[PDB]
Amino acid sequence: LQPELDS
Amino acid sequence: REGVFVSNGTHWFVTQRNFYEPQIITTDNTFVSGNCDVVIGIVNNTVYDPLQPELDS
Amino acid sequence: ALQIPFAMQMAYRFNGIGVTQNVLYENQKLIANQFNSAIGKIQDSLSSTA
Ligand SMILES: *[C@@H]1O[C@H](CO)[C@@H](O)[C@H](O)[C@H]1NC(C)=O
Ligand SMILES: *[C@@H]1O[C@H](CO)[C@@H](O)[C@H](O)[C@H]1NC(C)=O
């Protein structure tokens, strides 16, 4: 989730 | 991740072997290993990701 | 009897020994050559060693 959580 | 990929031709699903229970094919009920070239008899279908609409919300 | 493609049967034999089934499909030609060679050695064993 760490690199995906730009949202 | 468990069971078999199966199709009625119109759709693709996964189920355990010992009882038919079609589920959508996902990042949760599958695991990746490598590029497609190596596997004999592999097929193309869109693997869904449950996190995607939540990042879109 | 339920028909199943033989490579997928071997995949579920492999999960039966804790080797993850992608190890079969990534090595299928190699495994087929080993298995066919191993059956070949039985014929020589039986032909030589009554
Ligand atoms: C599967 O078998 C059919 C004939 O029954 C053949 O045309 C096809 O090329 C085979 N595919 C593979 C991946 O063995
Ligand atoms: C699967 O999709 C890729 C990329 O769209 C394509 O190159 C490939 O030919 C497709 N597979 C088959 C069996 O045609």
Side-chain angles (χ1 to χ4, degrees):
Chain A
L1 182 59
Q2 178 65 99
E4 295 294 350
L5 198 61
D6 293 340
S7 182
Chain B
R1 175 162 274 129
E2 296 185 350
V4 181
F5 295 136
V6 293
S7 177
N8 66 355
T10 45
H11 312 91
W12 280 90
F13 301 122
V14 57
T15 78
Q16 67 273 19
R17 287 170 294 279
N18 299 294
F19 186 86
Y20 183 65
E21 183 177 21
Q23 298 193 114
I24 307 301
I25 295 151
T26 72
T27 51
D28 285 346
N29 58 5
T30 69
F31 64 92
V32 173
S33 182
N35 52 291
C36 280
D37 310 55
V38 189
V39 180
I40 297 180
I42 191 158
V43 301
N44 290 0
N45 188 259
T46 56
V47 178
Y48 174 67
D49 185 21
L51 176 60
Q52 182 58 59
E54 312 311 323
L55 297 171
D56 301 325
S57 179
Chain C
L2 310 183
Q3 81 282 5
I4 182 172
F6 185 76
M8 304 185 76
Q9 163 174 328
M10 278 290 288
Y12 304 131
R13 303 306 189 139
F14 272 34
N15 274 4
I17 66 164
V19 177
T20 312
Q21 56 177 324
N22 73 296
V23 177
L24 172 63
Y25 300 120
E26 294 169 35
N27 296 287
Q28 182 174 334
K29 292 183 181 180
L30 170 62
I31 284 161
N33 292 345
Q34 288 206 23
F35 177 80
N36 295 340
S37 304
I39 294 289
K41 292 180 181 184
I42 307 309
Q43 301 186 354
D44 298 343
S45 178
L46 294 176
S47 300
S48 59
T49 315

